[PDB]
Amino acid sequence: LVPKLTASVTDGAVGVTVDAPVSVTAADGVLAAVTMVNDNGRPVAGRLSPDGLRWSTTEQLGYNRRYTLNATALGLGGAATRQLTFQTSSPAHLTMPYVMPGDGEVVGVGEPVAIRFDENIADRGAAEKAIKITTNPPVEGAFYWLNNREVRWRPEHFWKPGTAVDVAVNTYGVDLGEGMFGEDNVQTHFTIGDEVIATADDNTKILTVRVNGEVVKSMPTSMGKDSTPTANGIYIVGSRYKHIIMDSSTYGVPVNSPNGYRTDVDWATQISYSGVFVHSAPWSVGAQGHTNTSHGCLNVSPSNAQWFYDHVKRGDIVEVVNTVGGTLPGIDGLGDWNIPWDQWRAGNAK
Numbered sequence: 368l369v370p371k372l373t374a375s376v377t378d379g380a381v382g383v384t385v386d387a388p389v390s391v392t393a394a395d396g397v398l399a400a401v402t403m404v405n406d407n408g409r410p411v412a413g414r415l416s417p418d419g420l421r422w423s424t425t426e427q428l429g430y431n432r433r434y435t436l437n438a439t440a441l442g443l444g445g446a447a448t449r450q451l452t453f454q455t456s457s458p459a460h461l462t463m464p465y466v467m468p469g470d471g472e473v474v475g476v477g478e479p480v481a482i483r484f485d486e487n488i489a490d491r492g493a494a495e496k497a498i499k500i501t502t503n504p505p506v507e508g509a510f511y512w513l514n515n516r517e518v519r520w521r522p523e524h525f526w527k528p529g530t531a532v533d534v535a536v537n538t539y540g541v542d543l544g545e546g547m548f549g550e551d552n553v554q555t556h557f558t559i560g561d562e563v564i565a566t567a568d569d570n571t572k573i574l575t576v577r578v579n580g581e582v583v584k585s586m587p588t589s590m591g592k593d594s595t596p597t598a599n600g601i602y603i604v605g606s607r608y609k610h611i612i613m614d615s616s617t618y619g620v621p622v623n624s625p626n627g628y629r630t631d632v633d634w635a636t637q638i639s640y641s642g643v644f645v646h647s648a649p650w651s652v653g654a655q656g657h658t659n660t661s662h663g664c665l666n667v668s669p670s671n672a673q674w675f676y677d678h679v680k681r682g683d684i685v686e687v688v689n690t691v692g693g694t695l696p697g698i699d700g701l702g703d704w705n706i707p708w709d710q711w712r713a714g715n716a717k
């Protein structure tokens with residue numbers, strides 16, 4: 368029998384995607400030689416299987432390249448040789464994904480998986496298809512897009528402490544729509560830590576911190592006044608700051624406007640993209656636990672703000688209840704858990 372050669376690419380093929388390696392397989396014989404070069408003549412790294420039957424590229428192929436593959440198979444029946452040439456995808460534009468939380472992090476039970484692209488994604492389904500999420504213990508989750516660039520993945524209920532989460536964004540060589548291809552792959556892994564749920568009840572004006580179901584701190588607080596109230600709902604804890612200059616102009620509100628502001632505060636924990644924080648407020652200690660006086664932040668004492676800074680972590684949960692405000696928008700950026708599960712589960716890839 369004359370040896371046969373089978374490649375994972377077709378001679379004369381265009382638009383070949385570089386999201387997979389290129390392989391060469393020999394039948395009725397073994398591979399005596401296999402080389403692959405690009406248009407400039409530079410060789411492509413590869414490896415031959417010990418049995419001599421399979422050859423595969425070992426480095427990723429580039430966009431907008433013409434590769435020439437030459438292979439020779441030898442067998443008792445005879446010899447066979449083939450030359451193939453193919454052209455890879457020619458992207459119109461490239462987009463880089465950014466994944467949160469960070470690799471190796473320990474996050475709270477409310478932390479979703481976040482994949483943010485630096486460009487608008489026309490084929491959301493293709494993006495979701497290219498993201499493999501592993502969970503241990505395994506749990507059902509789903510994708511949901513906060514905007515044209517960022518997609519979130521979370522389960523129906525808060526994570527179970529101790530869950531391992533692994534995120535592989537394999538967007539390289541993937542057509543994300545309108546000629547937009549992924550600039551690279553990204554791969555992160557994180558773990559869920561203690562259950563920490565702080566509840567701010569406007570009827571009592573107390574921020575109570577519960578760690579694994581036990582109350583460990585009770586903080587008098589002053590929330591947003593009626594004209595600028597704090598929205599009810601579930602907030603995901605974000606970044607921590609020993610101190611931060613609060614500037615309303617970052618939210619489209621001129622500083623010189625009635626609701627504008629610009630001041631420096633200590634021990635600030637972010638809980639919404641819309642600008643809600645837990646922070647030190649020495650000027651309202653007298654009102655904390657009695658009346659609301661802020662632009663929407665949870666004003667707490669300096670010692671309680673610092674305690675919150677030291678003992679709360681990204682992904683922990685703050686829930687506000689019984690305020691005169693509405694509900695935090697589900698697409699705020701840290702309000703994911705305000706979207707009903709059935710809506711989140713059905714997604715919005717269009």
Ligand SMILES: *C(=O)/C=C\C(=O)Nc1ccc(Cl)cc1
Nearest residue numbers: 613628630642661662663664
């Ligand atoms: C919290 O109130 C939301 C944004 C912010 O920074 N507000 C704020 C805090 C303190 C002062 Cl004096 C003005 C506005």
Ligand code: NA
Nearest residue numbers: 405411428429
């Ligand atoms: Na190359």
Ligand code: NA
Nearest residue numbers: 612613614617
């Ligand atoms: Na700010």
